[PDB]
């Protein structure tokens, strides 16, 4: 029925494990190869299928090492993911929006034949930490063709992204003092309309930098959002709707369920 389904039927434990069910290979992107971004590493499933593609940007002063684990973990579930370095570590969100677009075009048009052939270039997503998260919002606003956006503890000058129609998962951190959710992630979340697919997930006991180490909640619901909207995979609806309990790693969850 759904031609884009990949991998076995999902369970909690499957989505929580450090690695998903697809075995993955890497392709190095040199800075000299990258036009308009700082290079990075492409993780892809070795199995010969087509998959959506995802570009992930780090945040201010951040390197790709800060987001590496999340690239390989998402890839291990059935996606082609590039984690990038940016042109300079001090680039601001709109510049990162540009580099995320550059990262997507590198994967689709510039990567080796082994990577390009595994990509359905009509199904793309962006993700970002902090200023990279504002990059994801800005490019999503500019590229309503994208199928998903996951800003992690995001910050952008502007908190009004009501013009975005891409299905967007905002992840915030309750102890975040650098992009406090009160002024950034939650104003960003509430700016998106009820008419689009969206959700807000606030980590419990979590600082701005919780996305930069392996985190089973971020891994689980990132994959779940990408499955539902990059792959149209309704097997994953049940993880997002009504979505995670509190009381235990999840402090708060809002959504426009049902999807
Ligand atoms: Li908390």
Author numbering: 41 to 287, 290 to 301
Sentences from the paper on this structure:
Unlike lipases, cutinases lack the active site-covering lid structure such that the substrate-binding cleft is exposed and directly accessible from bulk solution. In addition, the substrate-binding site is more expansive in cutinases compared to esterases, benefiting the binding of bulkier macromolecules. In this work, we investigate the PBAT hydrolysis potency of cutinases and PET-degrading enzymes, and find that cutinases outcompete other reported enzymes.
The crystal structure of apo-TfCut-DM was solved to 2.20 Å resolution and it contains two polypeptide chains in an asymmetric unit. Superimposing the structure with the previously reported WT TfCut yields an RMSD value of 0.255 Å for all Cα carbons, indicating that the overall structure is maintained. The crystal structure of TfCut-DM shows a classical α/β-hydrolase in which nine β-sheets are sandwiched by eight α-helices on both sides. It is worth noting that the side-chain of W195 in TfCut-DM switches from C-type conformation in the WT TfCut structure to B-type conformation according to the assignment in the previous publication. Since the Trp conformation is determined by the two-residue located beneath the Trp, we presumed that W195 can still wobble in the apo-form, though alternate conformations were not captured in this crystal.
